[PDB]
RNA sequence: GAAAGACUAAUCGAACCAUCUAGUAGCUGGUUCCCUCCGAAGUUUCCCUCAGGAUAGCUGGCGCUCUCGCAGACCCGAGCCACGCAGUUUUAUCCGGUAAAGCGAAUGAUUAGAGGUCUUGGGGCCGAAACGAUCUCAACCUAUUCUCAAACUUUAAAUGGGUAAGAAGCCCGGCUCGCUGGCGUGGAGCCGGGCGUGGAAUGCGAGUGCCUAGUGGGCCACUUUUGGUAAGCAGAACUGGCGCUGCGGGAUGAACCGAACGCCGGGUUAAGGCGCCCGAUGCCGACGCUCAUCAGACCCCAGAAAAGGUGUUGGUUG
RNA sequence: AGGCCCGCGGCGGGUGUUGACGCGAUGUGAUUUCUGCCCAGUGCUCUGAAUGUCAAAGUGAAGAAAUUCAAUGAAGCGCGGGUAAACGGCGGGAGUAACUAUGACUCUCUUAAGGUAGCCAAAUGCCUCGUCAUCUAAUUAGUGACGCGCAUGAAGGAUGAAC
RNA sequence: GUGCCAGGUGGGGAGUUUGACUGGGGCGGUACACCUGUCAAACGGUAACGCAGGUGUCCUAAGGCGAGCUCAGGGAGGACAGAAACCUCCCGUGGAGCAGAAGGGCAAAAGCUCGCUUGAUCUUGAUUUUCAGUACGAAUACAGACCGUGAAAGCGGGGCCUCACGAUCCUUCUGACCUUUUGGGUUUUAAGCAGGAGGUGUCAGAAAAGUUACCACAGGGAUAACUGGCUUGUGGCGGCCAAGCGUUCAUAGCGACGUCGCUUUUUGAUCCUUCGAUGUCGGCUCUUCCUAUCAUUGUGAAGCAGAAUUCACCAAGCGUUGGAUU
RNA sequence: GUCUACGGCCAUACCACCCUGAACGCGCCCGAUCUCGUCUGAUCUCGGAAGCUAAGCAGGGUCGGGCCUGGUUAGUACUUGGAUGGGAGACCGCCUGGGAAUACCGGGUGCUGUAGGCUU
RNA sequence: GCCCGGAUAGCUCAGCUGUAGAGCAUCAGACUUUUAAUCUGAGGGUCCAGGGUUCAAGUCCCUGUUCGGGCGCCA
């Protein structure tokens, strides 16, 4: 008839058998969820980075 | 119709006071906590004797009532009706419950067993700790043996183990008997009723100059 | 609840805020030539009895009131449906409440 | 049998401290949060908008997005046997800067200064901080005073 | 069927025969050689679900991508010593409202006196006469006082939870922007350049993919803990165990204590023991306590209380 | 030209080689004596009266047609009577007589009608091993009697020889 | 009358169904979808038919903005007027109010009163909560329109926050001078695309009444009825204190208020064993055991003069009967 | 040494009463034509400058209350980990680390940013 | 969801588009030895709500609130 309802017994052991790994912190996070206005201006800046290349290389030289 | 006190001796549950959640609590057996000449001044009864539990347990209100009656009768017999003042220092604030079962030859008669087993308020008990005072008697200094005997007799109405201790405090105050006299002399203490008011050396000087006047 | 018979709200055809007449939406009559009705009639014809479930376990006591808005622009009679929360008593353009008045004795 | 309400059990978590109710002080709004800096999520209850969930109260994350009134925070949350980096939008009332990060950047700057100075002046200096070492040998003078003899006191029942 | 659901070929609350038919079964029973290696779950969510499934978790198999180098033909190193990781500490830095404590601090509960002076308090004895008076008890106020709280709290631990402890860093310049804007402003991105004392301890080689079985009845112990008089009862938290596990000890015993296991020889231990059963005190062991006409004799654990004793032994106060 | 019934089907078949002193369908159960009240409910049945609703078909109208609408209006159901030897049902609360005790009597609330004649701790009464009498030395048994009877009762009640 | 269709009647007959949880099932209840406080052991999570409660609504304002005020209560005053009608001053950290349960939050607020309004509108994504990191619901931060309000900064896409709700299929409505409607064209019709609504409360969503003692099958000791086992509330039998009873006298004999135990000859509680079966009440017969001793043997005590009786000790050797009713 | 305007932290700043205040300032104050609101020029708005520091305000005071910070309470309460420790239990002791809170007794009573004045 | 039909002094019933009436409520008076039961009179209609038709509304037509029937039922 009746039976056990809930437990977390042995659950921690199951969790730690393969380790509780943190998320893989990797360079260049995704731009998901960033403000769209800021993102579109960022895209415009990236697009127009091409101009001023001669000035950039002159300064570098 | 009361269960034996062995069924509620121990402090097994969390405190369960009579509140807006626990309703329908019957009144406690003990309603009077102070007996004897309660109006006696502080210097009238210099000797104080306490009865102190050695166990962490629950004392029932009926047990407190019985011990109070026994101690009162012995104190009235020995020291007279105006020669002592007793104070019970335990109040039955913890409600003990009962899961009432039918005492008939039938379990089919909607007994339900342990289903919905939360009980109805049976009574009230007082929780006492190790080193906590249960009763206090203040009287003349020459009635020390009578106080000890009254508390010894009252011990038999309680489940656990209790000790009788003649306190160093003056009466029911919190100040030592040896320092009490000179503190009153230098007006660090002002008597009122059965207690003393401690007068610290801070505050307005008007309160200082109403004294010494 | 009470809602006024007119409101100034966005009109998708005009593209701006316009006055709208507000009515209560009622479910229209069944077509009898809708595809599901035709399929149901074909299924029910013949022997076999009832071939689709009949609900008969009603639990809700209210419905979500649907407001039919109609733009008052003569050239734009566009209509829209707004649903409001469930209510038991709904009225259109009832007597607006006052604050400092006497309740009937 | 527990409810799944968003604010169940937050009775003291989101309550204000004693005698600190009322107007929110404005320096909290005046703080500047850039992308990439480390913030602690607290969650005061005077402001009900943009509140973090109770599982992020007391956690610490990194700001990835800044809006007019809130920030986007990447904060680690442990769920069963895995940790996942949740992204939450939290109004700036419920966050504050992380002094751990502040002290670490201060230490980095000071270490770089020491490196430059020590390369200028030749002598090598220690930068890696060490754990507490064992105590070195030392002399304890009595100053012509005999140390006090201590004995345990006799027992007596007080109260 | 003069009625019993009776009888209808030992078959009747729907005969017998063959066939559909090897009907269906979340239920019961069984399921066939050896060795080696790895090795669980009785938990989450959803389901007319609760003796079952799906789902995540735990398992195995197959790999793949990388890291330390592979050293001297005997031999012989000739500040700096791997990518990265962690059921751990340290150093910083936050988070919390339990234990405790408090109620002469709020909210509730609550004991007793004391001091004051107004009132639809009772009243008060000679006050009606302006209680000429002032005696008591109330209520009220004030300062104290006894006792409390899982659904109270000023204060507030221990244990605990998050983050950080660098090369994806730091510092110089320069460029782009339609975002922002007093401003050569702010912010973000991008491009060059220089910095290695590799910026706590300790340990360890890491990352990543596919397929996937069994399980989804659990139970026990220390501690925390809810209901119940209690239960070898019912229900939770943490860790460990049994299940899946043999071995030494507890006489005996799923769980206790020790310790985990290939087949052996020698040495030594653990827990536990050493009169005899039964290995080991067959020590010239030490100091005391105790006589029981129901003595006592070792975790769990397998039987006892209040109360007594001029039995005896210590000790305290007088 | 029927009632009741069989029948896959036939103007098929049984009752029926029959005809109301007959067939068919029920209940109760010899004789004796009785068989009370209730047609609100559910059934059954009679009447269609203007009559409400009411399918297909048919009629009219709109449309280019599919289609839509309208008018009309069979049984049945509603509306109206009858019927309990049809199924069934058949009440409470207060006060009141010159000792007390009962309550002939009086008030109200209510029903469709409030259980009548009878009978009873009965094979039907919980309380109950009811109370009284008788039978015994002693009887939770038996009989007789009583009756606010949990929950007796009239096509079945109560009796009555013979078996 | 027959043939065909239409409506009614139709347990005479047919097929099927008649939830789940559950200290066994049923009856009861909803712990079945949600929300608050606690449990809960100071991150989060955490169960019982655990405790205290609440929900299937309500609101053109109780939504939005702005402005101006301060609330509950109390003290002192004023014609009728009194304990409460209105007016005035003072104190007032909120002891009020904010729709509701509770918790949190809030004072030139989020409360009260006015003024103007409809951001409770049209859209795309991201995110949080439950979580499998699926959905629904709810929520947060943005971005693009069109607006409201205010001098403006700003604020507003419902309600101060934590609840107030619903898939596929089908239906209905709204929108695109949109797509398709089958050889082509026009027009009805129909289908589609996007967004609302009609509901599944067993709330991730079958369409559902009983009875079986005439019963059947697969199983279950996962689960009751009888023994046994744990417990001992209740039953039974004892002990401690001694206020009292006992003509006086606590304790010859009793023992209130309290309190400590024992027993498993009561009844419960539980569900560990047994459902491929342990024959289930009583009586008869027969043996043995226990002692908490009714009698008998030996004793102690009395409110034991004798007689009778009562209390207690050693003590289970021996005995403890014949009958009416059931 | 102070003030004014705008503030940050938000009582060491609050509350009660008392004393002092030079110069600027801030105020109280005077009036209602205009602007604007009222039952009321009381508030709000507006136009002023006769008088006053009485009040606000600032500074100081009080064996002041509160608040802040210490000591005590107290290595107490409580607590991580350990034992084939004690005890019939209830509970308690020890080892290993951590460690509170009242009452009671002290000290203190705003600091400061920007801009602009006054103070011989 | 569809087709009908009723709402009127306290009650019941009628009812114009050009006068809300009748019998019973209730009450004051007139009698009769008390009574009767018969009049004189007072007191009442929200003519169920709204809109439109309206010189003329309870009245005519629609939209709303209940009450009765008979239909029909794929989320
Ligand atoms: Mg399970
Ligand atoms: Mg408990
Ligand atoms: Mg039968
Ligand atoms: Mg078969
Ligand atoms: Mg099985
Ligand atoms: Mg808590
Ligand atoms: Mg506590
Ligand atoms: Mg308090
Ligand atoms: Mg258990
Ligand atoms: Mg169990
Ligand atoms: Mg197994
Ligand atoms: Mg294992
Ligand atoms: Mg093992
Ligand atoms: Mg062994
Ligand atoms: Mg043993
Ligand atoms: Mg060996
Ligand atoms: Mg041995
Ligand atoms: Mg030997
Ligand atoms: Mg016959
Ligand atoms: Mg009859
Ligand atoms: Mg008809
Ligand atoms: Mg008749
Ligand atoms: Mg009768
Ligand atoms: Mg009878
Ligand atoms: Mg009988
Ligand atoms: Mg006989
Ligand atoms: Mg008889
Ligand atoms: Mg008679
Ligand atoms: Mg059938
Ligand atoms: Mg915890
Ligand atoms: Mg928690
Ligand atoms: Mg405002
Ligand atoms: Mg917008
Ligand atoms: Mg909101
Ligand atoms: Mg569900
Ligand atoms: Mg079992
Ligand atoms: Mg008992
Ligand atoms: Mg006496
Ligand atoms: Mg057998
Ligand atoms: Mg047998
Ligand atoms: Mg004996
Ligand atoms: Mg002070
Ligand atoms: Mg310690
Ligand atoms: Zn429009």
CB D77 within 8 A of CB D57: no
Tokens of B180: 């009490």
CA B202/CA C85 separation, integer angstroms? 66
Distance A1 CA to G274 C1' (A): 18
> Cβ–Cβ contacts within 10 Å for residue A44, how many?
10
Tokens of B23: 């309703």
D66 touches strand G (CB under 7 A): no
Phi/psi for D62 (5° steps) reads -115, 135
CA B139/CA D47 separation, integer angstroms? 62
Distance from CA of A48 to the nearest CA of D (A): 23
CB B31 within 8 A of CB B184: no
Phi/psi for A47 (5° steps) reads -65, -40
Q: At what angle do helices B61-79 and B144-155 cross, to 10 degrees?
A: 150
Whole-number Cα distances in Å, A52 to A41, A42, A49, A61, B159: 18, 17, 7, 14, 95
CB C11 within 8 A of CB C77: no
Rg (CA), chain D: 26
Furthest-apart CA pair in chain D: how many Å? 72
Whole-number Cα distances in Å, D6 to D2, D52, D53, D92, D144: 12, 10, 7, 20, 70
Contact of A14 with chain D, judged by CB distance below 8 Å, is answered with: yes
Nearest nucleic acid nucleotide to B152, CA to C1' distance: G241
Is the CB of D64 less than 8 angstroms away from the CB of A35? no
Task: Give the alpha-carbon dihedral of A32, A38, A41, A45, to 10 degrees.
Answer: -70
- How far is the first Cα of chain B from the last one, in angstroms, to the nearest whole number? 63
Distance A6 CA to G274 C1' (A): 30
Closest residue in chain A to residue D77, using alpha carbons only: A22
| CA C4 to chain CA mean position, Å | 15
CA D159/CA D156 separation, integer angstroms? 10
CA C4/CA C24 separation, integer angstroms? 11
C-alpha D46 to ligand 6 mean position (Å): 20
HEC secondary structure over B103-132 = CCCCCCCCCCCCCCCCCEEEEEEEEECCCC
Measured at the CA of B29, the angle between CA B129 and CA B12, to 5 degrees, comes to 35
Residues from chain A that touch D87, judged by Cβ atoms under 8 A, are 33
Distance D15 CA to G180 C1' (A): 62
CA B26/CA B33 separation, integer angstroms? 18
Closest C-alpha to B12, from B116, B121, B125, B130: B125
C-alpha B113 to ligand 26 mean position (Å): 45
Q: Are strands B34-36 and B84-88 parallel, antiparallel or unpaired?
A: antiparallel
Could you write out the DSSP letters of every residue in A17-43?
HS--PPP---SS---TTS-HHHHHHHH
């Amino acid at each position: 008839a009746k039976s056990k309802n809930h437990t977390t017994h042995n659950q921690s052991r199951k969790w730690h058998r393969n380790g509780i790994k943190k998320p893989r912190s990797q360079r260049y996070e995704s731009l998901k969820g960033v403000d769209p206005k800021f993102l579109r201006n960022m895209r415009f800046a990236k697009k127009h980075n091409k101009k001023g290349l001669k000035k950039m290389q002159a300064n570098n030289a | 119709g009361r269960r034996p006190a062995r069924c509620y001796r121990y402090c097994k549950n969390k405190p369960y006071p009579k509140s807006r959640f626990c309703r329908g609590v019957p009144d406690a057996k003990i309603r009077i906590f102070d007996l004897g000449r309660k109006k006696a001044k502080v210097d009238e009864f210099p000797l104080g004797g306490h009865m102190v539990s050695d166990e962490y347990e629950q004392l029932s209100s009926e047990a407190l009532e019985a011990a109070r009656i026994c101690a009162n009768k012995y104190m009235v017999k020995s020291c007279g009706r105006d020669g002592f003042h007793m104070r019970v220092r335990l109040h039955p604030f913890h409600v003990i419950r009962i899961n009432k079962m039918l005492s008939c030859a039938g379990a089919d008669r909607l007994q339900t067993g342990m289903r919905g087993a939360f009980g109805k308020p049976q009574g009230t008990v007082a929780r006492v700790h190790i080193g906590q005072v249960i009763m206090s008697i203040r009287t003349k200094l020459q009635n020390e043996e009578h106080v000890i005997e009254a508390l010894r007799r009252a011990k038999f109405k309680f489940p656990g183990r209790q000790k009788i201790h003649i306190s160093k405090k003056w009466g029911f105050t919190k100040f030592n008997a040896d320092e009490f006299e000179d503190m009153v002399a230098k007006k660090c203490l002002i008597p009122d009723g059965c207690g003393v008011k401690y007068v610290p050396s801070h505050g307005p000087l008007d309160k200082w100059r109403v004294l010494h006047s | 609840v009470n809602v006024p018979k007119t409101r100034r709200t966005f009109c998708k055809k005009c593209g701006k805020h316009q006055p709208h007449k507000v009515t209560q939406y009622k479910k229209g009559k069944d077509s009898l030539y809708a595809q599901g009705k035709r399929r149901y009639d074909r299924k029910q014809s013949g022997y076999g009895g009832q071939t689709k479930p009949i609900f008969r376990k009603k639990a809700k006591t209210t419905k979500k009131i649907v407001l039919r808005l109609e733009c008052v622009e003569p050239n734009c009679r566009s209509k829209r449906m707004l649903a409001i929360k469930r209510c038991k008593h709904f009225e259109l353009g009832g007597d607006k409440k006052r604050k400092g008045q006497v309740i009937q004795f | 049998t527990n409810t799944k309400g968003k604010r169940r059990g937050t009775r003291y978590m989101f309550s204000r401290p004693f005698r600190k109710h009322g107007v929110v002080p404005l320096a909290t709004y005046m703080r500047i949060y850039k992308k990439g800096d480390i913030v602690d999520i607290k969650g005061m209850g005077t402001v009900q908008k943009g509140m973090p969930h109770k599982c992020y109260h007391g956690k610490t994350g990194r700001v990835y997005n800044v809006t007019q009134h809130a920030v986007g925070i990447v904060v680690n949350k442990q769920v069963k046997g895995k940790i996942l980096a949740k992204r939450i939008n939290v109004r700036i009332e419920h966050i504050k800067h992380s002094k751990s990060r502040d002290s670490f950047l201060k230490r980095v700057k000071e270490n770089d200064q020491k490196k430059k100075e020590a390369k200028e002046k030749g002598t090598w200096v220690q930068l890696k901080r060490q754990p507490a070492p064992p105590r070195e040998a030392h002399f304890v003078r009595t100053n012509g005073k005999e140390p006090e003899l201590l004995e345990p006191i006799p027992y007596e029942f007080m109260a």
